[PDB]
Symmetry: C2
Subunit: 174 residues, 2 copies
């Protein structure tokens, strides 16, 4: 049970918080039948593409609102697994970055998955990549999951397109 | 092919670099038959246990020395997969921290996986957990991989002991 709203763009841009570029920073497209082969299920049929290399978008999940009460979290600590799929485009290099945080009730960063940026080298095609992380043993107080991704916000145009993203998920393990 | 030597203590502490505590910081024990069922390959039979809550140990993998050549590293950037297993002990709190770096020829940190500390809550048992990370799209220039793990080096005793560790690996995906 994926706790992120609108993982692939089926509701267009709804459910996502946009950066300064707003609506103009993003487009939703259909995957070629070929690209559909690259995902676990055959339920991934769309994707988001940044219009400009710095574009990011974000969502915050309220765990209590999703059925995960205070005490299950503090006491049981179930695995929270976060995944994303990103790619470049056919013919040049993209940059991508993902930030996922586990937040307390007053928004302290209690845990953080912020891997280095991904540099997607240029190629005739644009294979999808997955990125995955599981939080366990994360401690008491976890209430929100903030999930943010897109291009690398930098003052410096150095060649690199923004990424394509789709199939974002967050879930709590049984 | 796992590029870490001695991932389980079959060779005692050989191949590992020890912290200030050297050898008194570590013991190798045999897993009970029940504890061996928690691992995939039936070939994990020992583990490492910290003698003090701060003890760490590390290895540095030279990737050219392992057959991974410059052009493969700089242009293909094949997935570098890193895994570790850790637990506590029955009835106390343990704390654990893993630090994995990709390094250039000069030891510049090109990519780093340093997840927040794991707080292993106290419990009747000591179930192993696995931690796993894949490095892809990490850019050119990677030559060494440093793998460090153990308890949390803090000056302050808070009751939290160090962990047990085993079956550590780093491999390069075909």
């Amino acid at each position: 049970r994926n706790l992120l709203r609108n993982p692939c763009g089926e509701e267009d841009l709804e459910g996502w918080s946009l950066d300064v570029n707003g609506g103009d920073g993003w487009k939703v497209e259909e995957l070629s039948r070929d690209q559909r082969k690259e995902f676990p299920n055959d339920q991934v049929k769309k994707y988001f593409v940044t219009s400009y290399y710095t574009c990011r978008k974000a969502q915050v999940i309220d765990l209590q609102a999703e059925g995960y009460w205070e005490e299950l979290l503090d006491t049981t600590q179930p695995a929270i697994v976060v995944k994303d799929w990103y790619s470049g485009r056919p013919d040049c290099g993209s940059k991508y970055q993902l930030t996922v945080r586990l937040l307390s009730e007053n928004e302290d960063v209690l845990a953080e998955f912020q891997p280095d940026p991904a540099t997607i080298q240029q190629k005739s095609d644009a294979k999808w990549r997955e990125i995955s992380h599981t939080f366990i043993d994360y401690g008491p107080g976890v209430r929100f999951v903030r999930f943010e991704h897109g291009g690398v916000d930098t003052h410096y145009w150095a060649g690199w397109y923004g990424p394509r993203v789709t199939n974002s998920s967050v879930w709590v393990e049984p």
